[PDB]
Amino acid sequence: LCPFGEVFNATRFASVYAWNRKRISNCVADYSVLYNSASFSTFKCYGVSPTKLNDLCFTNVYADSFVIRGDEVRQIAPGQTGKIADYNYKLPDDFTGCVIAWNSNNLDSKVGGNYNYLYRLFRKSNLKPFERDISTEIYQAGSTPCNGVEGFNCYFPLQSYGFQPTNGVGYQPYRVVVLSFELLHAPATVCG
Amino acid sequence: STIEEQAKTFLDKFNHEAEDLFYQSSLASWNYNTNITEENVQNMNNAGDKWSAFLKEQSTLAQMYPLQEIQNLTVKLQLQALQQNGSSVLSEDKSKRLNTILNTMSTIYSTGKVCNPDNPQECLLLEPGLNEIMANSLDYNERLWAWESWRSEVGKQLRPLYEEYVVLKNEMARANHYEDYGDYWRGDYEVNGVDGYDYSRGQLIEDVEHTFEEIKPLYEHLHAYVRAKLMNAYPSYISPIGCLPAHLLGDMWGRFWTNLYSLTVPFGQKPNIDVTDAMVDQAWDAQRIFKEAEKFFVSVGLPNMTQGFWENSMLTDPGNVQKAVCHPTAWDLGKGDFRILMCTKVTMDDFLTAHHEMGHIQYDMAYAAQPFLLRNGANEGFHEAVGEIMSLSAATPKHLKSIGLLSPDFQEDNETEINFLLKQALTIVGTLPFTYMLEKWRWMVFKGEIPKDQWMKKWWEMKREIVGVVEPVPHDETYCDPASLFHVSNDYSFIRYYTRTLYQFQFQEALCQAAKHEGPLHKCDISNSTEAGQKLFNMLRLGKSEPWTLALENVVGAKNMNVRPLLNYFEPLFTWLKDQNKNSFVGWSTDWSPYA
Numbered sequence: 208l209c210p211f212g213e214v215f216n217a218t219r220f221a222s223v224y225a226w227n228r229k230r231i232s233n234c235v236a237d238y239s240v241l242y243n244s245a246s247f248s249t250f251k252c253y254g255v256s257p258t259k260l261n262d263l264c265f266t267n268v269y270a271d272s273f274v275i276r277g278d279e280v281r282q283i284a285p286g287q288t289g290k291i292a293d294y295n296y297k298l299p300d301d302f303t304g305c306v307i308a309w310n311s312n313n314l315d316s317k318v319g320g321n322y323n324y325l326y327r328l329f330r331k332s333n334l335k336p337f338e339r340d341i342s343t344e345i346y347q348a349g350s351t352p353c354n355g356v357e358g359f360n361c362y363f364p365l366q367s368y369g370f371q372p373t374n375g376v377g378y379q380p381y382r383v384v385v386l387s388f389e390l391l392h393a394p395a396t397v398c399g
Numbered sequence: 400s401t402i403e404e405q406a407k408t409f410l411d412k413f414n415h416e417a418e419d420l421f422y423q424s425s426l427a428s429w430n431y432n433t434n435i436t437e438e439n440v441q442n443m444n445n446a447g448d449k450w451s452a453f454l455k456e457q458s459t460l461a462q463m464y465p466l467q468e469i470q471n472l473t474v475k476l477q478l479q480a481l482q483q484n485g486s487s488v489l490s491e492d493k494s495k496r497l498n499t500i501l502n503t504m505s506t507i508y509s510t511g512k513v514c515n516p517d518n519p520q521e522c523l524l525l526e527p528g529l530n531e532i533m534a535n536s537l538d539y540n541e542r543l544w545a546w547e548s549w550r551s552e553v554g555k556q557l558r559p560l561y562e563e564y565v566v567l568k569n570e571m572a573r574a575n576h577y578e579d580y581g582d583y584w585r586g587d588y589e590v591n592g593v594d595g596y597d598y599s600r601g602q603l604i605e606d607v608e609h610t611f612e613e614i615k616p617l618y619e620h621l622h623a624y625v626r627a628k629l630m631n632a633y634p635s636y637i638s639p640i641g642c643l644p645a646h647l648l649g650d651m652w653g654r655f656w657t658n659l660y661s662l663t664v665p666f667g668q669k670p671n672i673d674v675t676d677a678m679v680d681q682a683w684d685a686q687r688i689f690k691e692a693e694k695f696f697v698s699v700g701l702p703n704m705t706q707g708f709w710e711n712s713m714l715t716d717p718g719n720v721q722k723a724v725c726h727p728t729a730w731d732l733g734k735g736d737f738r739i740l741m742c743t744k745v746t747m748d749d750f751l752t753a754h755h756e757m758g759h760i761q762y763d764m765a766y767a768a769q770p771f772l773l774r775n776g777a778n779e780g781f782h783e784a785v786g787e788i789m790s791l792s793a794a795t796p797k798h799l800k801s802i803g804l805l806s807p808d809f810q811e812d813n814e815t816e817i818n819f820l821l822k823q824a825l826t827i828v829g830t831l832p833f834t835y836m837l838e839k840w841r842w843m844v845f846k847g848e849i850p851k852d853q854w855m856k857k858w859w860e861m862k863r864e865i866v867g868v869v870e871p872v873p874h875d876e877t878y879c880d881p882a883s884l885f886h887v888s889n890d891y892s893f894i895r896y897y898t899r900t901l902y903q904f905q906f907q908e909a910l911c912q913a914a915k916h917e918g919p920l921h922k923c924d925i926s927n928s929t930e931a932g933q934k935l936f937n938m939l940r941l942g943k944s945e946p947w948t949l950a951l952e953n954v955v956g957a958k959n960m961n962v963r964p965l966l967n968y969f970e971p972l973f974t975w976l977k978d979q980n981k982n983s984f985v986g987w988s989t990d991w992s993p994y995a
C-alpha cells in the first residue's frame with residue numbers, strides 16, 4: 208500500500224498557484240474504496256473506465272492537489288479553457304486521468320475570510336500544460352515599464368481567495384485533487 | 400498596445416477586488432439589521448467607509464482611460480458606471496455638507512411625535528403612532544390635527560435644510576457634465592451607443608407625460624367614484640363637486656389608498672377573498688409560508704433556493720433583546736449569499752410579501768454570471784417591478800385554490816371580482832398620479848425654474864390639477880411639507896415607482912400570452928408553464944449588461960415604455976365604473992370651492 212490518506216485527508220492543502228505534484232509509485236492502490244465514499248461531488252474520469260482501471264493499470268501515478276472555488280471547478284478538464292485552467296493549472300488534451308473534487312466548507316473556511324489561498328490572475332503568456340509558475344513578477348498591461356511599484360498598468364498578479372462560511376454553493380471552496388495516469392518507457396507498473 | 404485590452408485588465412482586477420469588499424460591507428450591514436448593539440453601528444460604518452473610499456480610488460484610476468476608442472460595449476458600460484465622480488468633484492468644505500445634511504434628514508424622519516400641543520399625555524414612534532391614526536380612525540377634526548402633527552412639526556425644520564440640499568446637489572450636475580440633478584436621476588434610463596435603441600435623457604419626460612393621457616381617463620372615474628363613497632362618512636365636511644382632502648387618503652401622504660377599501664367596498668355582502676382565518680386552521684408557520692412560495696417558482700421554471708438560505712436567513716422576530724427593525728427587504732450580499740429580512744406573520748399581506756420579496760432574490764441570482772459592475776437591474780424600475788409580477792399572480796383566486804388556502808367551492812361572479820380589482824386599483828392605479836406629480840415637482844425644483852417663494856403655490860396647484868386634492872388648510876411658503884416623505888428626504892429617486900406599474904403589467908400580459916391563458920388578466924396565473932418561465936429568465940439574466948430597451952423587446956416586443964397593457968388589466972373595473980358614474984360629477988377642474 209501507499210499513503211493516499213496523506214494527500215486526500217491532509218490538514219493543509221496547497222494553493223492553485225503552488226499546486227504540489229507528489230509522485231506515487233511502487234504501491235498497491237484501492238480505487239474501489241474511493242467510489243463508495245459518498246462524499247465527492249465532481250468525480251469525473253477522462254480516458255479510463257472505473258472498472259478498467261482495476262484489472263489493468265499504469266505506473267507514473269503523479270497526483271496534483273490544489274484549492275478551487277466551486278463555480279470554477281469545471282475549468283479543470285482537458286480541452287476546457289477559462290481563468291484558472293489558463294493561468295494556473297492547464298490540463299493537456301487526451302488527459303488520461305480522473306478529477307476528484309469535494310466540498311470543504313467546514314474546514315477550508317473561517318469567519319472574516321480565509322485569505323490564505325492565492326491564484327494567478329494576470330500572465331503575459333498562456334501556460335503550456337502541466338506547468339507550475341511560482342513567481343512574484345508583476346504584469347505589464349500596456350507599454351510603460353514597471354519597476355515593482357504598483358501603478359495603473361502594473362497589476363500584481365497574485366490575488367487572494369476569500370472563503371467565508373456563509374458563501375454560496377458556487378463560491379464554496381471545493382477541495383479538489385487530480386490523479387494523472389500515463390505509461391511511458393518507465394517499467395515496473397504497479398496495479399490495484 | 401491598445402486601450403481596449405488595458406481596460407479589460409483593470410476591470411478584471413476591479414471585479415475580484417470589489418466583490419471581496421462588497422461582501423464584507425453587506426455582511427456587516429446584515430448583522431446591523433438583525434442584532435442591534437452599540438458596537439454594531441460602528442462595525443457597519445467601519446466596513447462601509449472603506450468600501451466607499453475604495454470606489455474613490457478606483458474612479459480616479461479609470462478616469463485616465465479615454466472613452467473614444469472602446470468598440471466593445473460590455474466594458475463600455477462598466478467604465479461609464481465606474482467613472483461617475485459623484486461627490487469627488489466637490490471641495491472639502493462642500494463635501495461635508497453631504498453627510499451632515501443627509502444624516503440630519505434620517506434623524507429628523509426618525510422622530511415620532513403625536514403629542515398634542517398644550518396637552519402632553521404621551522406619544523409613540525411612527526409605526527405604532529402615526530400609522531394607526533390615518534388607517535383606522537374616521538374623524539375629520541383629529542385627522543386634520545394629525546395631518547398638521549407631522550407636516551407642521553417635522554417638515555417645518557426642513558425648509559432651510561432641504562433648500563440648502565437642492566442648491567448644492569444641483570451644482571454637482573455641471574461638475575458631472577449633466578443638465579440638473581433631476582437630469583442626473585434620468586441617467587439610469589439613458590441608453591447610448593446602440594443604433595436605433597438609444598434613449599435620450601430628455602425622452603423620459605416626454606414618455607412619462609405621453610403615457611399619462613391614458614392613465615387619466617381611468618383615474619377620472621376612480622376619483623369620481625371614491626369621492627361619492629367617502630362623503631358618506633363625512634356628510635357635511637366634503638362637497639361632492641370638488642376634489643378630496645389630503646388627510647383622508649389612507650396614509651399621511653396619500654401615496655397608497657389601501658385603507659380606503661373598507662370604506663369604499665363595492666359589494667361587502669358577499670365575503671372577500673380572505674384566507675387569514677384559513678391558515679390558522681391548518682397550522683401554518685413561517686417555514687410553510689415560504690416553502691409554498693419556493694415551489695411556486697420552481698413550477699414556473701426558475702431555480703429553487705439554495706441550502707445556504709433557509710438555515711441562514713431569519714423568518715420570525717427572534718429573541719427578546721434583539722430590537723432590530725424587520726422591514727421586508729431583499730438582501731444580495733454577493734458570492735452566492737442571498738437572504739430575506741422580514742418578520743413573518745400569518746396574514747394576507749405577509750403571505751403575498753413572501754412571494755413578493757422572493758422575486759427580487761430570483762432576479763438576483765439571474766445575473767450572478769454577470770460582472771460585479773453589471774450585477775444590477777436594467778434600471779431602477781426593473782428590480783422593483785420584477786418583484787411584484789409574482790405578487791399579482793399569487794393573489795389570484797386560481798392560485799389560492801391551487802394550494803388549498805381558498806375554499807374548494809368559491810364562485811366567481813361579477814361582484815367577487817370587482818371587490819378584488821378595486822383593492823388592486825387603490826394600491827396601483829391610485830399611486831400613479833401621486834408618483835408622477837411629486838417627481839414632476841422634484842424635477843423642476845432641481846432644474847431651478849421655481850423660485851424660493853413659489854415652491855408651495857406650484858406644488859399645491861399641481862396636486863389639485865394632476866392628483867386632484869383640495870388642501871385641508873392653506874399653507875404659505877415657509878412650510879416644507881413635500882419633503883416630509885421617506886424617499887424625498889433620504890435621496891431616493893421616486894420615478895422608479897411610476898415605471899414600476901407600467902413594467903409590472905407589460906410583463907404580466909407578455910407572460911400570460913406565453914402561458915396561453917384563456918381569459919382576462921385578473922384571473923391569469925403564471926405557474927405550471929415552463930414556456931413563460933423561459934421567456935422571463937432570458938431577460939432576468941441580462942442585468943445591466945444589455946440596455947433596458949432591449950430587455951423589453953425580449954419579453955413584449957415593444958422597445959418603448961408601453962401603457963396599453965395596463966388598462967386591459969382594469970377593463971372589467973373600468974366598464975363598471977363608467978356605468979356607475981352616470982350621474983356623479985366625473986372630471987374635476989381647478990377647485991378652490993371647499994376651503995376658499
Ligand SMILES: *[C@@H]1O[C@H](CO)[C@@H](O[C@@H]2O[C@H](CO)[C@@H](O)[C@H](O)[C@H]2NC(C)=O)[C@H](O)[C@H]1NC(C)=O
Pocket residue numbers: 211212213215216240
Ligand atoms: C478520510 O477520513 C474519513 C473519515 O474517517 C475516512 O472515511 C472512513 O473510511 C473508512 C473505510 O471505509 C470507514 O470504515 C469509515 O466509516 C469512514 N468514516 C467516515 C466518517 O465516513 C476516509 O476513508 C479517509 N480517506 C483517506 C484517503 O484516508
Ligand SMILES: *[C@@H]1O[C@H](CO)[C@@H](O[C@@H]2O[C@H](CO)[C@@H](O)[C@H](O)[C@H]2NC(C)=O)[C@H](O)[C@H]1NC(C)=O
Pocket residue numbers: 698797798801924926927
Ligand atoms: C400546478 O401543478 C400542480 C402539480 O400537478 C397541481 O397540483 C395538483 O392539483 C390537483 C388538484 O388541484 C391534485 O389532484 C394533484 O394531486 C396535484 N398534484 C400534486 C403533484 O400535488 C396544481 O393544481 C397546478 N395548478 C394549477 C393552477 O394548474
Ligand SMILES: *[C@@H]1O[C@H](CO)[C@@H](O)[C@H](O)[C@H]1NC(C)=O
Pocket residue numbers: 434435436720721
Ligand atoms: C445580540 O445582541 C445582544 C445585545 O443586543 C448581545 O448580547 C448578543 O451577543 C447578540 N448576539 C449575536 C449573535 O450577535
Ligand SMILES: *[C@@H]1O[C@H](CO)[C@@H](O)[C@H](O)[C@H]1NC(C)=O
Pocket residue numbers: 470471472473474
Ligand atoms: C466584448 O468583450 C467580451 C469579452 O468576453 C465578449 O464576450 C463580447 O462578445 C464583446 N462584445 C463585442 C461587441 O465585441
Ligand SMILES: *[C@@H]1O[C@H](CO)[C@@H](O)[C@H](O)[C@H]1NC(C)=O
Pocket residue numbers: 462482483484487488574575576
Ligand atoms: C472627475 O474629477 C477629476 C478631477 O478633476 C476630473 O479630472 C474628471 O474629469 C472628473 N470626471 C468626470 C466624469 O467629470
Ligand SMILES: *[C@@H]1O[C@H](CO)[C@@H](O)[C@H](O)[C@H]1NC(C)=O
Pocket residue numbers: 703704705706
Ligand atoms: C432544487 O431542485 C433540484 C431539482 O430537482 C433538486 O435536486 C434540489 O434538491 C432542490 N433544492 C431544494 C433546496 O429544494
Ligand SMILES: *[C@@H]1O[C@H](CO)[C@@H](O)[C@H](O)[C@H]1NC(C)=O
Pocket residue numbers: 811812813
Ligand atoms: C353580471 O352582471 C350582468 C348584468 O346584470 C348579469 O347579466 C350577469 O349574469 C352577471 N354575472 C354573473 C356571473 O352573475
